[PDB]
Amino acid sequence: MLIVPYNLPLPGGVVPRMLITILGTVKPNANRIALDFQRGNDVAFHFNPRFNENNRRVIVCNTKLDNNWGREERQSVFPFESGKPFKIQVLVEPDHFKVAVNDAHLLQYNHRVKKLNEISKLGISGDIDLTSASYTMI
Ligand SMILES: O=C1N[C@H](C(=O)O)CC2=C1S[C@H]1[C@@H](O2)O[C@H](CO)[C@H](O)[C@@H]1O[C@@H]1O[C@H](CO)[C@H](O)[C@H](O)[C@H]1O
Ligand SMILES: [Cl-]
């Protein structure tokens, strides 16, 4: 397994048609997963499955600018399950990140950070066994 937290450099940032694929397995009794697409200290796109927020499962997405979190975007469709293997695909499109889990579209997140070519790292963290993390241009 890859060591979590894991840093995947994104050379020259992201760009439309870049597809990022994360494969792993959720731990038993997991609490959280997080993908952090970072522009230096800023987080352009935070994708944060929460397994037990007041006994509900929710995916929180947000952006962190100058150490301040913005307005969350929340999705109640929750495809992850403790103990089970998953695939996350993040396709960069002109206006948003488009996320599919296990080959099913999940959500889109509009670009708040405009300098896509400066979003040059992806941090992967949380309660997973991480199998692989990679990108390709489609
Ligand atoms: O510790 C905290 N200090 C804040 C204070 O002291 O003002 C208040 C606050 C928490 S926790 C939790 C919860 O209240 O509700 C908030 C929205 O109302 C957030 O959901 C927040 O969680 C944070 O959300 C971020 C994404 O927005 C990241 O995921 C981050 O990792 C995570 O810590
Ligand atoms: Cl920007």
Residue with CA closest to ligand 1 atom 29: 48
- Which residues are paired to 90 by β-bridges? 20, 99
**Burial letters 111-137, b for 16+ CB under 10 A, else e:** bebeebebbbbbbbbbbbebeebebee
Q: Which residues line ligand 1 (CB under 6 A)?
A: 46, 48, 60, 62, 69, 72
Reported resolution, Å: 1.1
Phi, psi of 55 (to 5 degrees): 70, 20
Q: How far is CA 111 from CA 3, 61, 99, 137, in A?
A: 29, 12, 13, 19
The total number of structural domains that make up the chain: 1
Range(s) of the domain holding residue 74: 1-138
Q: What is the CATH number of the domain that holds 110?
A: 2.60.120.200
CA distances from 84 to 28, 44, 123 (A): 8, 28, 21
Q: Which ligand is nearest to the CA of 36?
A: 1
CA atoms of 57 and 113, how far apart (whole Å): 27
CA separation, residue 18 to residues 13, 44, 59, 94 (Å):
10, 15, 22, 11
Any binding-site annotation on 118?
no
